């Protein structure tokens, strides 16, 4: 009656160049919980910006965004309110309760 | 009566260039819970922006967004409210309760 | 009476160039729950923007979006409200309760 | 009386270039639940935008969207309200309850 | 009395270029449930936009959308309300309850 | 036997505002001769030009003449040739040859 | 037998404002001769030009003449040629040859 | 037998403001001769030019003449040639040859 | 047998403001001769130029003439040639040859 | 048998402000001769230039002439040639040859 987990990675020849959250041999038992959360952001992998030119002769405004991944003008609100009673929130990887 | 999990990755020759959340041999038992959450964002993989030009002679406004993945002008609200009673929210990978 | 899971990945020659959430040999038992959630975003994979030009002589406004995947002007609201009673929400990968 | 799952991937020569949620040998037992959710977004895979030109001599407005997949001007609301009683919502991958 | 599932993928020579939700050898037992949900979005695979030009001499308005897949001006509302009693909603991959 | 000429001008109150070749009391005995002559010209007396506006957006030519008296594009030739013999041309005011 | 000429001008109150070749009491005996002559010119008396505006956006040519009396583009030739013999040209005011 | 000429000008109150070749009491005996002559010119008397504005955005040429009397682009030739014989040209004011 | 000429000018109150070649009591006996002559010029009397503005953004040429009397671009030639024989040209004011 | 000429000018109150070649009581006997002559010039009397402004942003040429009387770009030639024989040219004021 015993938990057993392991992860092997025998790499003869391998490459991980520009990656994110890779798993190349793992034994995971994660459990996660997110109540009021908020992600805002832009990500680029192997991007190229190769020549940009902006001019402005006689103007009152000029805005510009050019990069390989842009995010502008957001108004986010992510909340969770509890004014009553009882807000259990459980999250587990696994449960092993076995008799004999 | 025993849990057994494992993950192998024998790589003779492999490549993971520009990826996200890859799994190349895993044994996962995840459980997740999200109550009030919010994602806003733009992602680019192997993008190329190769020559941009904007001008403005006599204008009151000029806005511009050019990158390989753009997101603009959002107004997001993601909430969860509980003013009554009882909001159980359970999430598990697996459950092993077996007698003998 | 024992759970057994595993994942193999013997790669002689393989490539994963610009991908997202790939699985190349896994044994998964996930369980997930999303109550009030919201996704807004644009994604590009192997995109090319190869020459853009905008001008403006005498104008009061000019807006422009050119990238390979654009998203503009959204007004999203995703909520869940409970003012009564009882909002169980359960999600599991599997359940093994067998006697003998 | 034992659950058994596994996933093999012997790759002699393979390619996954620009993909999303691929499975190349898996044993999955997922269960998912979504109460009030909302997706808004545009996705491009192997797109090319190869020469764009916009001008404006004397105008009060000019808007433009050119990328390979555009989404504009949405007003989404996705909700679930419970003011009465009883909103069970269960979702499982499988259930094994067998006696002997 | 034992569940047995597996997935093989022996690839001598294969290609998956621009795909979405492919399965090349799997053993799945999914179960899913969606109560109030909403999808809005445009997707492009191997698209080409090869030369666009718009002008405007003296106008009060001009809007334009050109990309390979466009979606504009939607007003979506997808909800589920329960003010009475009893809203069971169950979804399973399979069920194995056999005696002996 | 005597020539007698004179000119009086008793001006109590008079005005000559914008005139040309006026005679207000004279005794003239002119004689004139014009062989090859040429007059080209425009004359204005008490003229008013009170607001002129010309524009040109995109043209190859635009000519304009607005004043109170215009003359344009003439090709004049006024000559007198004598290759023979005898071209007397006499002009006198008067002749007084009287005997007694 | 005597020539007698005179010119009086008794001015109590008079005005000559903008004039040309006026005679206000004279005794003239002129004689004139013009063989090959040429006049080109514009004259203005009491003229007013009260507001002129010309613009040119994108043109190859634009010519303009606005004044109260204009003359443009003439090609004048006024000549007299004598290759034969005899070109007397006499002009006198008067002649007084009287015997007694 | 005697020539007698004179000119009086008794001015109690007079004005000559902007004039040309005026005679206010004279006794003239002129004689003139013009063989090959040429006049080109513009004259203004009591002229007003009260506000002129010219602009040019993007042009290859723009010419302009605005004054109260303009003259442009003439090509004048006024000549007299004598290759034969005899070109008498006499001009006198008067002649008094009277015997007794 | 005697020539007699004179000129009086008794000015009680007079004004000569902006004039040219005025005669206010004279006794003239002029004689003039002009063979090859040429006048080119512009004259102004009591002129006003009260506000001029010229601009030029991006042009290859711009010429302008604004004054109250302008003259531009002339090509004048006034000549007299004599290759034969005999070109008498006499001009006298008067002649008094009377016997007794 | 005697020439007699004189000129009076009794000025009680007079003014000569801005004039040219005025004669206010004279007795003249002029004689003049002009063979090859040339006048080029501009004259102003009581002129006012009251505010001039010229600008130039990005131009290859800009010429301008504003004064109250302008003359530009002339090409004058005034000549007299004699290659034959005999070019008498006489001009006298008067001649008095009377016997007795």
mmCIF file of N, CA and C in Angstrom, chain F residues 15-98:
data_model
loop_
_atom_site.group_PDB
_atom_site.id
_atom_site.type_symbol
_atom_site.label_atom_id
_atom_site.label_comp_id
_atom_site.label_asym_id
_atom_site.label_seq_id
_atom_site.Cartn_x
_atom_site.Cartn_y
_atom_site.Cartn_z
ATOM 1 N N UNK F 15 -13.337 120.346 -61.506
ATOM 2 C CA UNK F 15 -12.674 119.120 -61.088
ATOM 3 C C UNK F 15 -12.400 118.270 -62.317
ATOM 4 N N UNK F 16 -11.198 117.706 -62.386
ATOM 5 C CA UNK F 16 -10.827 116.730 -63.403
ATOM 6 C C UNK F 16 -10.196 115.565 -62.653
ATOM 7 N N UNK F 17 -10.951 114.488 -62.463
ATOM 8 C CA UNK F 17 -10.573 113.471 -61.479
ATOM 9 C C UNK F 17 -9.670 112.394 -62.073
ATOM 10 N N UNK F 18 -10.187 111.624 -63.023
ATOM 11 C CA UNK F 18 -9.415 110.539 -63.631
ATOM 12 C C UNK F 18 -9.694 110.576 -65.127
ATOM 13 N N UNK F 19 -8.903 111.355 -65.848
ATOM 14 C CA UNK F 19 -9.189 111.656 -67.236
ATOM 15 C C UNK F 19 -7.948 111.405 -68.070
ATOM 16 N N UNK F 20 -8.057 111.706 -69.356
ATOM 17 C CA UNK F 20 -6.976 111.428 -70.291
ATOM 18 C C UNK F 20 -7.202 112.264 -71.533
ATOM 19 N N UNK F 21 -6.237 113.115 -71.864
ATOM 20 C CA UNK F 21 -6.295 113.961 -73.050
ATOM 21 C C UNK F 21 -7.518 114.874 -73.025
ATOM 22 N N UNK F 22 -7.637 115.645 -71.956
ATOM 23 C CA UNK F 22 -8.705 116.623 -71.876
ATOM 24 C C UNK F 22 -8.180 117.966 -72.341
ATOM 25 N N UNK F 23 -9.078 118.794 -72.856
ATOM 26 C CA UNK F 23 -8.724 120.146 -73.267
ATOM 27 C C UNK F 23 -9.826 121.084 -72.821
ATOM 28 N N UNK F 24 -9.480 122.029 -71.962
ATOM 29 C CA UNK F 24 -10.480 122.887 -71.358
ATOM 30 C C UNK F 24 -10.205 124.325 -71.743
ATOM 31 N N UNK F 25 -10.042 124.554 -73.035
ATOM 32 C CA UNK F 25 -9.769 125.861 -73.585
ATOM 33 C C UNK F 25 -8.402 125.883 -74.213
ATOM 34 N N UNK F 26 -8.340 125.650 -75.521
ATOM 35 C CA UNK F 26 -7.075 125.543 -76.231
ATOM 36 C C UNK F 26 -7.286 126.056 -77.641
ATOM 37 N N UNK F 27 -6.184 126.373 -78.305
ATOM 38 C CA UNK F 27 -6.186 126.730 -79.718
ATOM 39 C C UNK F 27 -5.062 125.921 -80.339
ATOM 40 N N UNK F 28 -5.417 124.816 -80.971
ATOM 41 C CA UNK F 28 -4.454 123.833 -81.427
ATOM 42 C C UNK F 28 -4.360 123.848 -82.945
ATOM 43 N N UNK F 29 -3.166 123.571 -83.449
ATOM 44 C CA UNK F 29 -2.919 123.503 -84.879
ATOM 45 C C UNK F 29 -2.030 122.312 -85.188
ATOM 46 N N UNK F 30 -2.399 121.149 -84.676
ATOM 47 C CA UNK F 30 -1.533 119.987 -84.755
ATOM 48 C C UNK F 30 -1.537 119.370 -86.148
ATOM 49 N N UNK F 31 -0.458 118.657 -86.444
ATOM 50 C CA UNK F 31 -0.364 117.817 -87.618
ATOM 51 C C UNK F 31 0.464 116.593 -87.292
ATOM 52 N N UNK F 32 -0.009 115.407 -87.651
ATOM 53 C CA UNK F 32 0.623 114.180 -87.200
ATOM 54 C C UNK F 32 0.703 113.191 -88.347
ATOM 55 N N UNK F 33 1.658 112.273 -88.254
ATOM 56 C CA UNK F 33 1.888 111.287 -89.298
ATOM 57 C C UNK F 33 2.420 110.015 -88.662
ATOM 58 N N UNK F 34 1.806 108.884 -88.990
ATOM 59 C CA UNK F 34 2.170 107.603 -88.399
ATOM 60 C C UNK F 34 2.271 106.588 -89.520
ATOM 61 N N UNK F 35 3.447 106.004 -89.710
ATOM 62 C CA UNK F 35 3.657 105.134 -90.869
ATOM 63 C C UNK F 35 3.494 103.666 -90.485
ATOM 64 N N UNK F 36 4.389 103.154 -89.649
ATOM 65 C CA UNK F 36 4.201 101.823 -89.113
ATOM 66 C C UNK F 36 4.216 101.879 -87.608
ATOM 67 N N UNK F 37 3.054 101.705 -86.983
ATOM 68 C CA UNK F 37 2.889 101.947 -85.557
ATOM 69 C C UNK F 37 2.051 100.813 -84.992
ATOM 70 N N UNK F 38 2.051 100.695 -83.672
ATOM 71 C CA UNK F 38 1.351 99.610 -83.026
ATOM 72 C C UNK F 38 1.080 99.917 -81.569
ATOM 73 N N UNK F 39 -0.190 99.888 -81.190
ATOM 74 C CA UNK F 39 -0.599 100.074 -79.804
ATOM 75 C C UNK F 39 -1.205 98.811 -79.227
ATOM 76 N N UNK F 40 -0.700 98.354 -78.093
ATOM 77 C CA UNK F 40 -1.323 97.255 -77.382
ATOM 78 C C UNK F 40 -1.346 97.601 -75.917
ATOM 79 N N UNK F 41 -2.513 97.615 -75.293
ATOM 80 C CA UNK F 41 -2.553 97.916 -73.878
ATOM 81 C C UNK F 41 -3.971 98.041 -73.370
ATOM 82 N N UNK F 42 -4.094 97.918 -72.052
ATOM 83 C CA UNK F 42 -5.370 97.968 -71.356
ATOM 84 C C UNK F 42 -5.356 99.082 -70.322
ATOM 85 N N UNK F 43 -6.461 99.815 -70.227
ATOM 86 C CA UNK F 43 -6.550 100.973 -69.354
ATOM 87 C C UNK F 43 -7.795 100.883 -68.490
ATOM 88 N N UNK F 44 -7.665 101.291 -67.232
ATOM 89 C CA UNK F 44 -8.758 101.251 -66.272
ATOM 90 C C UNK F 44 -8.866 102.595 -65.574
ATOM 91 N N UNK F 45 -10.094 103.058 -65.374
ATOM 92 C CA UNK F 45 -10.351 104.309 -64.679
ATOM 93 C C UNK F 45 -11.475 104.093 -63.684
ATOM 94 N N UNK F 46 -11.166 104.259 -62.399
ATOM 95 C CA UNK F 46 -12.116 104.053 -61.309
ATOM 96 C C UNK F 46 -12.644 102.620 -61.306
ATOM 97 N N UNK F 47 -11.716 101.676 -61.251
ATOM 98 C CA UNK F 47 -12.049 100.268 -61.221
ATOM 99 C C UNK F 47 -11.917 99.705 -59.820
ATOM 100 N N UNK F 48 -12.679 98.653 -59.543
ATOM 101 C CA UNK F 48 -12.674 98.007 -58.237
ATOM 102 C C UNK F 48 -12.723 96.505 -58.441
ATOM 103 N N UNK F 49 -11.785 95.791 -57.832
ATOM 104 C CA UNK F 49 -11.776 94.336 -57.820
ATOM 105 C C UNK F 49 -11.803 93.921 -56.361
ATOM 106 N N UNK F 50 -12.904 93.310 -55.926
ATOM 107 C CA UNK F 50 -13.229 93.224 -54.505
ATOM 108 C C UNK F 50 -13.463 91.779 -54.073
ATOM 109 N N UNK F 51 -12.483 90.931 -54.315
ATOM 110 C CA UNK F 51 -12.536 89.609 -53.733
ATOM 111 C C UNK F 51 -12.484 88.508 -54.754
ATOM 112 N N UNK F 52 -11.337 87.854 -54.819
ATOM 113 C CA UNK F 52 -11.042 86.848 -55.822
ATOM 114 C C UNK F 52 -10.425 85.657 -55.113
ATOM 115 N N UNK F 53 -10.810 84.456 -55.522
ATOM 116 C CA UNK F 53 -10.269 83.255 -54.905
ATOM 117 C C UNK F 53 -10.195 82.162 -55.951
ATOM 118 N N UNK F 54 -9.016 81.588 -56.133
ATOM 119 C CA UNK F 54 -8.831 80.469 -57.041
ATOM 120 C C UNK F 54 -8.099 79.362 -56.307
ATOM 121 N N UNK F 55 -8.504 78.119 -56.547
ATOM 122 C CA UNK F 55 -7.862 76.972 -55.934
ATOM 123 C C UNK F 55 -7.526 75.991 -57.043
ATOM 124 N N UNK F 56 -6.708 74.999 -56.710
ATOM 125 C CA UNK F 56 -6.374 73.964 -57.683
ATOM 126 C C UNK F 56 -5.893 72.738 -56.926
ATOM 127 N N UNK F 57 -6.676 71.666 -56.962
ATOM 128 C CA UNK F 57 -6.326 70.463 -56.224
ATOM 129 C C UNK F 57 -5.250 69.647 -56.919
ATOM 130 N N UNK F 58 -5.566 69.068 -58.070
ATOM 131 C CA UNK F 58 -4.595 68.221 -58.758
ATOM 132 C C UNK F 58 -4.799 68.412 -60.258
ATOM 133 N N UNK F 59 -4.093 69.378 -60.826
ATOM 134 C CA UNK F 59 -4.305 69.752 -62.211
ATOM 135 C C UNK F 59 -2.968 69.881 -62.916
ATOM 136 N N UNK F 60 -3.001 69.765 -64.237
ATOM 137 C CA UNK F 60 -1.792 69.966 -65.013
ATOM 138 C C UNK F 60 -1.584 71.417 -65.411
ATOM 139 N N UNK F 61 -2.649 72.207 -65.510
ATOM 140 C CA UNK F 61 -2.551 73.615 -65.869
ATOM 141 C C UNK F 61 -3.751 74.352 -65.317
ATOM 142 N N UNK F 62 -3.549 75.628 -65.018
ATOM 143 C CA UNK F 62 -4.652 76.525 -64.703
ATOM 144 C C UNK F 62 -4.156 77.946 -64.878
ATOM 145 N N UNK F 63 -4.736 78.674 -65.825
ATOM 146 C CA UNK F 63 -4.373 80.065 -66.034
ATOM 147 C C UNK F 63 -5.592 80.907 -65.703
ATOM 148 N N UNK F 64 -5.354 82.169 -65.365
ATOM 149 C CA UNK F 64 -6.440 83.017 -64.902
ATOM 150 C C UNK F 64 -6.033 84.475 -65.011
ATOM 151 N N UNK F 65 -6.981 85.317 -65.411
ATOM 152 C CA UNK F 65 -6.794 86.759 -65.462
ATOM 153 C C UNK F 65 -8.089 87.410 -65.019
ATOM 154 N N UNK F 66 -8.014 88.316 -64.051
ATOM 155 C CA UNK F 66 -9.221 88.803 -63.398
ATOM 156 C C UNK F 66 -9.378 90.313 -63.449
ATOM 157 N N UNK F 67 -8.317 91.080 -63.621
ATOM 158 C CA UNK F 67 -8.404 92.522 -63.468
ATOM 159 C C UNK F 67 -9.438 93.170 -64.367
ATOM 160 N N UNK F 68 -9.784 94.406 -64.012
ATOM 161 C CA UNK F 68 -10.880 95.124 -64.641
ATOM 162 C C UNK F 68 -10.755 95.316 -66.139
ATOM 163 N N UNK F 69 -9.586 95.059 -66.719
ATOM 164 C CA UNK F 69 -9.423 95.145 -68.167
ATOM 165 C C UNK F 69 -8.195 94.333 -68.541
ATOM 166 N N UNK F 70 -8.392 93.215 -69.231
ATOM 167 C CA UNK F 70 -7.306 92.289 -69.509
ATOM 168 C C UNK F 70 -7.132 92.155 -71.012
ATOM 169 N N UNK F 71 -5.910 91.831 -71.425
ATOM 170 C CA UNK F 71 -5.562 91.594 -72.818
ATOM 171 C C UNK F 71 -4.493 90.520 -72.830
ATOM 172 N N UNK F 72 -4.741 89.426 -73.541
ATOM 173 C CA UNK F 72 -3.820 88.303 -73.505
ATOM 174 C C UNK F 72 -3.708 87.637 -74.866
ATOM 175 N N UNK F 73 -2.528 87.093 -75.129
ATOM 176 C CA UNK F 73 -2.290 86.287 -76.306
ATOM 177 C C UNK F 73 -2.537 86.973 -77.627
ATOM 178 N N UNK F 74 -1.803 88.039 -77.917
ATOM 179 C CA UNK F 74 -1.917 88.701 -79.205
ATOM 180 C C UNK F 74 -0.635 88.446 -79.976
ATOM 181 N N UNK F 75 -0.738 88.544 -81.294
ATOM 182 C CA UNK F 75 0.414 88.401 -82.181
ATOM 183 C C UNK F 75 0.223 89.433 -83.280
ATOM 184 N N UNK F 76 0.757 90.621 -83.055
ATOM 185 C CA UNK F 76 0.527 91.755 -83.926
ATOM 186 C C UNK F 76 1.768 92.039 -84.753
ATOM 187 N N UNK F 77 1.555 92.414 -86.007
ATOM 188 C CA UNK F 77 2.619 92.894 -86.875
ATOM 189 C C UNK F 77 2.051 93.999 -87.746
ATOM 190 N N UNK F 78 2.607 95.194 -87.620
ATOM 191 C CA UNK F 78 2.139 96.354 -88.362
ATOM 192 C C UNK F 78 3.342 96.976 -89.041
ATOM 193 N N UNK F 79 3.383 96.914 -90.367
ATOM 194 C CA UNK F 79 4.563 97.319 -91.101
ATOM 195 C C UNK F 79 4.165 98.139 -92.307
ATOM 196 N N UNK F 80 5.163 98.781 -92.900
ATOM 197 C CA UNK F 80 5.013 99.452 -94.183
ATOM 198 C C UNK F 80 6.321 99.326 -94.937
ATOM 199 N N UNK F 81 6.272 98.740 -96.121
ATOM 200 C CA UNK F 81 7.463 98.494 -96.914
ATOM 201 C C UNK F 81 7.372 99.261 -98.220
ATOM 202 N N UNK F 82 8.498 99.810 -98.660
ATOM 203 C CA UNK F 82 8.572 100.572 -99.899
ATOM 204 C C UNK F 82 9.807 100.087 -100.643
ATOM 205 N N UNK F 83 9.606 99.262 -101.667
ATOM 206 C CA UNK F 83 10.695 98.809 -102.517
ATOM 207 C C UNK F 83 10.648 99.413 -103.906
ATOM 208 N N UNK F 84 9.623 100.195 -104.213
ATOM 209 C CA UNK F 84 9.543 100.854 -105.496
ATOM 210 C C UNK F 84 10.147 102.237 -105.426
ATOM 211 N N UNK F 85 9.319 103.268 -105.577
ATOM 212 C CA UNK F 85 9.819 104.633 -105.523
ATOM 213 C C UNK F 85 8.667 105.579 -105.242
ATOM 214 N N UNK F 86 8.875 106.500 -104.310
ATOM 215 C CA UNK F 86 7.950 107.593 -104.113
ATOM 216 C C UNK F 86 6.917 107.270 -103.063
ATOM 217 N N UNK F 87 7.088 107.805 -101.861
ATOM 218 C CA UNK F 87 6.181 107.525 -100.757
ATOM 219 C C UNK F 87 5.951 108.787 -99.938
ATOM 220 N N UNK F 88 5.687 109.902 -100.617
ATOM 221 C CA UNK F 88 5.422 111.142 -99.908
ATOM 222 C C UNK F 88 4.226 110.965 -98.992
ATOM 223 N N UNK F 89 4.318 111.541 -97.794
ATOM 224 C CA UNK F 89 3.240 111.466 -96.810
ATOM 225 C C UNK F 89 3.303 112.738 -95.972
ATOM 226 N N UNK F 90 2.475 113.719 -96.314
ATOM 227 C CA UNK F 90 2.514 115.031 -95.690
ATOM 228 C C UNK F 90 1.243 115.274 -94.897
ATOM 229 N N UNK F 91 1.382 115.946 -93.758
ATOM 230 C CA UNK F 91 0.244 116.218 -92.886
ATOM 231 C C UNK F 91 0.489 117.520 -92.147
ATOM 232 N N UNK F 92 -0.377 118.503 -92.364
ATOM 233 C CA UNK F 92 -0.203 119.825 -91.790
ATOM 234 C C UNK F 92 -1.478 120.261 -91.091
ATOM 235 N N UNK F 93 -1.324 121.179 -90.141
ATOM 236 C CA UNK F 93 -2.486 121.697 -89.442
ATOM 237 C C UNK F 93 -3.287 122.651 -90.299
ATOM 238 N N UNK F 94 -2.631 123.666 -90.844
ATOM 239 C CA UNK F 94 -3.241 124.486 -91.879
ATOM 240 C C UNK F 94 -2.140 125.183 -92.656
ATOM 241 N N UNK F 95 -2.529 125.780 -93.774
ATOM 242 C CA UNK F 95 -1.605 126.452 -94.673
ATOM 243 C C UNK F 95 -2.221 127.781 -95.065
ATOM 244 N N UNK F 96 -1.458 128.859 -94.920
ATOM 245 C CA UNK F 96 -1.938 130.201 -95.235
ATOM 246 C C UNK F 96 -0.951 130.843 -96.204
ATOM 247 N N UNK F 97 -1.229 130.730 -97.497
ATOM 248 C CA UNK F 97 -0.414 131.344 -98.540
ATOM 249 C C UNK F 97 -1.327 132.205 -99.398
ATOM 250 N N UNK F 98 -1.538 133.451 -98.997
ATOM 251 C CA UNK F 98 -2.426 134.343 -99.723
ATOM 252 C C UNK F 98 -1.705 135.628 -100.094
#
